[PDB]
Write an enzyme that holds these catalytic residues in place. Structure first.
Site, PDB file in Angstrom:
ATOM      1  N   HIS A   1       0.905  -1.177  -0.009  1.00 15.79           N
ATOM      2  CA  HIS A   1      -0.057   0.075  -0.075  1.00 15.79           C
ATOM      3  C   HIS A   1       0.919   1.239   0.107  1.00 15.79           C
ATOM      4  O   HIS A   1       0.537   2.189   0.039  1.00 15.79           O
ATOM      5  CB  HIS A   1      -0.988  -0.198   1.066  1.00 15.79           C
ATOM      6  CG  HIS A   1      -0.573   0.216   2.334  1.00 15.79           C
ATOM      7  ND1 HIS A   1      -0.554  -0.868   3.402  1.00 15.79           N
ATOM      8  CD2 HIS A   1      -0.087   1.288   3.193  1.00 15.79           C
ATOM      9  CE1 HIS A   1      -0.121  -0.087   4.482  1.00 15.79           C
ATOM     10  NE2 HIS A   1       0.160   1.077   4.552  1.00 15.79           N
TER      11      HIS A   1
ATOM     12  N   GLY B   1       2.398   6.102   9.966  1.00 15.07           N
ATOM     13  CA  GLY B   1       3.896   6.159   9.662  1.00 15.07           C
ATOM     14  C   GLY B   1       4.532   4.890  10.135  1.00 15.07           C
ATOM     15  O   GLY B   1       5.680   4.528   9.918  1.00 15.07           O
TER      16      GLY B   1
ATOM     17  N   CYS C   1       3.588   1.699   9.331  1.00 14.72           N
ATOM     18  CA  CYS C   1       3.645   0.481   8.488  1.00 14.72           C
ATOM     19  C   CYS C   1       4.905   0.145   8.018  1.00 14.72           C
ATOM     20  O   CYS C   1       5.869   0.953   7.842  1.00 14.72           O
ATOM     21  CB  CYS C   1       2.452   0.842   7.631  1.00 14.72           C
ATOM     22  SG  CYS C   1       0.825   1.138   8.094  1.00 14.72           S
TER      23      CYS C   1
HETATM   24  N1  LIG Z   1      -9.976   2.331  11.458  1.00 15.80           N
HETATM   25  C1  LIG Z   1      -9.097   2.983  11.424  1.00 15.80           C
HETATM   26  C2  LIG Z   1      -7.692   3.776  11.287  1.00 15.80           C
HETATM   27  C3  LIG Z   1      -6.912   3.475  10.300  1.00 15.80           C
HETATM   28  S1  LIG Z   1      -7.394   4.221   8.468  1.00 15.80           S
HETATM   29  O1  LIG Z   1      -8.666   3.862   8.304  1.00 15.80           O
HETATM   30  O2  LIG Z   1      -7.103   5.325   8.567  1.00 15.80           O
HETATM   31  N2  LIG Z   1      -6.645   3.352   7.351  1.00 15.80           N
HETATM   32  C4  LIG Z   1      -7.049   2.490   6.654  1.00 15.80           C
HETATM   33  C5  LIG Z   1      -6.364   1.267   6.168  1.00 15.80           C
HETATM   34  C6  LIG Z   1      -6.850   0.017   5.548  1.00 15.80           C
HETATM   35  C7  LIG Z   1      -6.033  -0.942   5.275  1.00 15.80           C
HETATM   36  C8  LIG Z   1      -4.771  -0.727   5.384  1.00 15.80           C
HETATM   37 CL1  LIG Z   1      -3.704  -2.156   4.751  1.00 15.80          CL
HETATM   38  C9  LIG Z   1      -3.882   0.298   5.683  1.00 15.80           C
HETATM   39  C10 LIG Z   1      -5.143   1.438   6.090  1.00 15.80           C
HETATM   40  C11 LIG Z   1      -4.232   2.848   6.729  1.00 15.80           C
HETATM   41  C12 LIG Z   1      -3.131   3.052   5.991  1.00 15.80           C
HETATM   42  C13 LIG Z   1      -2.347   4.040   6.439  1.00 15.80           C
HETATM   43  C14 LIG Z   1      -1.792   3.922   8.008  1.00 15.80           C
HETATM   44  N3  LIG Z   1      -2.952   3.138   8.675  1.00 15.80           N
HETATM   45  C15 LIG Z   1      -2.520   2.967  10.015  1.00 15.80           C
HETATM   46  C16 LIG Z   1      -1.874   1.975  10.551  1.00 15.80           C
HETATM   47  N4  LIG Z   1      -1.355   1.735  11.852  1.00 15.80           N
HETATM   48  C17 LIG Z   1      -1.804   2.701  12.776  1.00 15.80           C
HETATM   49  C18 LIG Z   1      -2.522   3.800  12.333  1.00 15.80           C
HETATM   50  C19 LIG Z   1      -2.838   4.622  13.173  1.00 15.80           C
HETATM   51  C20 LIG Z   1      -3.510   5.829  13.047  1.00 15.80           C
HETATM   52  C21 LIG Z   1      -3.889   5.956  11.749  1.00 15.80           C
HETATM   53  C22 LIG Z   1      -3.494   5.125  10.740  1.00 15.80           C
HETATM   54  C23 LIG Z   1      -2.662   4.116  11.010  1.00 15.80           C
HETATM   55  C24 LIG Z   1      -4.001   2.299   7.988  1.00 15.80           C
HETATM   56  O3  LIG Z   1      -4.524   1.579   8.840  1.00 15.80           O
HETATM   57  C25 LIG Z   1      -5.451   3.979   6.792  1.00 15.80           C
HETATM   58  C26 LIG Z   1      -7.721   5.289  11.703  1.00 15.80           C
HETATM   59  C27 LIG Z   1      -6.903   4.358  12.616  1.00 15.80           C
END
Ligand SMILES: N#CC1(CS(=O)(=O)N2Cc3ccc(Cl)cc3[C@@]3(CCCN(c4cncc5ccccc45)C3=O)C2)CC1
Ligand SMILES: N#CC1(CS(=O)(=O)N2Cc3ccc(Cl)cc3[C@@]3(CCCN(c4cncc5ccccc45)C3=O)C2)CC1
Ligand SMILES: [Cl-]
Lengths: 305, 306
Positions: free
Chosen positions: B41, B143, B145
């Protein structure tokens, strides 16, 4: 999101760990530049511990009596001296992996990471706090002496603890890297005990701010308190008194959540007087006190090293 | 004495962390030999995440669209390929700090250390467990990931997790190092949620054995139980079923303490019914489930404090 007991990355310290053997006693040493630092009790037999005269034991030793092993390489000791409860072994090789470092003495309530070691080989890393009674609730077995505690700031390792002993209650005691013990402990096999401990109030408040940042707000209320009235409650529940310095240190967390420190103190007062009523805070049924205000800010901001 | 949530020393993994940037998206990569592994991603915008077509996004990229930074050195990407949900960037430099390693896919209940990283720089290390619902209760911000999970049994690093996402309940999901997700999760912003989670029974039993080794027996009782009756009771408190494999794995801890597994099961049944009555076990007021039987043997003394 999430809140874990997080330690600093240990790599810079792993590259400093060595094994020090003197006779039948073997423990860990910290190799920085051309000096290996270790507990001075490495020169004692079990019998000597009962009443050691460290200067008299040391004068009978030569440099070649100290065997220092770094990985699979034997270092040559070319000098030795004692500084308080730490032995300094001058070696013929400077550690090529010496990081930028300082020796710092911490105060009760401060946290640090411990790199548990055995036979000069790192086994694990965990976080702990210097208790108000100057002990640490570590996890250490026989052979772990010489393992160190540290904090990191950017690229600099601040070494703050060297492990020396376990007390009858299973808690631990040690020195700073200058060999000064934390607490009224001595390096000898004699009757010693951890004093009565207290809860680190400023750290509990920091962890309640961490719970708010992560979405746990059930314990918040409309009330406030004065510092004087709150401290009456803290004294009753075996909590450390909260000072104006502690209130000031909580400023950034108070600003990032919009909850005044004395407002959070009124929440802590109600938690102490009534309990959690079947609820948990950040997955805990106890009020956690081993996260400082800086630890909370660092984990909720992503600071790197 | 003592019992802490202990992580493996992280140095061997720190020497592998790099930053990967594609356009405006920046995350972490794992540099082993001449390959950098990262979440696929990295090639997506926020809009792409609703219905990403990774093959169509990737075909429009060249090697020089991927910026890889290791410390203060820019690595040159000379090839790229996608394997499941990971991107593999072939670089012109083999990592001189590559440790001895393996890629291992773990099962629920297993623990590992996480080296949380931002911009290719390590920030902290903590322990966690793969939950029965295939999520992890991590501590990760935007950040993080590409941060990895691992174990280091006998100087070889076993990489088992790469971080990809946070779910609405604040828990985390990711893949093994072959890019296969743990759990029914997809690297797409879909209505996917963490399923109902349960307690890892075999780990709670292991931690009760740790408490006995460290000198405490207050919670034991004079009763035993059958495996089926224990499972009937435990499932009422949302505990995972205990299998004969779990009983076998607890064998060495049962032998060191002299307490049969089904007798420890009877103790656990009673703690679930009574609670702790103001007492703690290894400094906890809750039954801990993120220490495996292997973790207890690794940390605890081989001699019980009788
Ligand atoms: N519910 C909820 C959220 C996640 S999201 O909806 O912003 N999101 C959907 C998503 C879907 C699938 C995949 Cl593979 C990746 C991702 C992303 C990609 C960017 C990075 N992220 C994050 C990853 N780890 C910790 C995070 C901590 C706060 C923010 C984003 C974070 C993701 O989860 C974005 C808000 C907490
Ligand atoms: N109460 C108690 C004990 C410790 S002791 O009484 O055997 N002990 C007194 C003592 C006094 C001063 C100094 Cl500087 C060092 C030491 C020693 C030197 C050897 C290593 N050690 C240990 C240190 N850390 C973790 C230990 C885990 C189990 C065993 C020993 C351990 C010490 O504490 C020995 C039995 C747990
Ligand atoms: Cl597994």
């Amino acid at each position: 999101s999430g809140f874990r007991k997080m330690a600093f990355p240990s790599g810079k310290v792993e590259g400093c760990m060595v094994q020090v053997t003197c006779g039948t006693t073997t423990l860990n040493g910290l190799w920085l530049d051309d000096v290996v630092y270790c507990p001075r009790h490495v020169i004692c037999t079990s019998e000597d511990m009962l009443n050691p005269n460290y200067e008299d034991l040391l004068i009978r030793k030569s440099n070649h009596n100290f065997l220092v092993q770094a990985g699979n390489v034997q270092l040559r000791v070319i000098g030795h001296s004692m500084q308080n409860c730490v032995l300094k072994l001058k070696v013929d090789t400077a550690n090529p992996k010496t990081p930028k470092y300082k020796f710092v003495r911490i105060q009760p309530g401060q946290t640090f990471s411990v790199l548990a070691c055995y036979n000069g080989s790192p086994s694990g890393v965990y976080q702990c706090a210097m208790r108000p009674n100057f002990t640490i609730k570590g996890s250490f077995l026989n052979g772990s002496c010489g393992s160190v505690g540290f904090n990191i700031d950017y690229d600099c390792v601040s070494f703050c603890y060297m492990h020396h002993m376990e007390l009858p209650t299973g808690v631990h005691a040690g020195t700073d890297l200058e060999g000064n013990f934390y607490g009224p402990f001595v390096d000898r096999q004699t009757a010693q005990a951890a004093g009565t401990d207290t809860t680190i109030t400023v750290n509990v408040l920091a962890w309640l701010y961490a719970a708010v940042i992560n979405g746990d707000r059930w314990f918040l209320n409309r009330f406030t308190t004065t510092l004087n009235d709150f401290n009456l409650v803290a004294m009753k529940y075996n909590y450390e008194p909260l000072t104006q310095d502690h209130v000031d240190i909580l400023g950034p967390l108070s600003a990032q959540t919009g909850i005044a420190v004395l407002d959070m103190c009124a929440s802590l007062k109600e938690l102490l007087q009534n309990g959690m009523n079947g609820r948990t805070i950040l997955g805990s049924a106890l009020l956690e006190d081993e996260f400082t205000p800086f630890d909370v800010v660092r984990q909720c901001s992503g600071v790197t090293f």
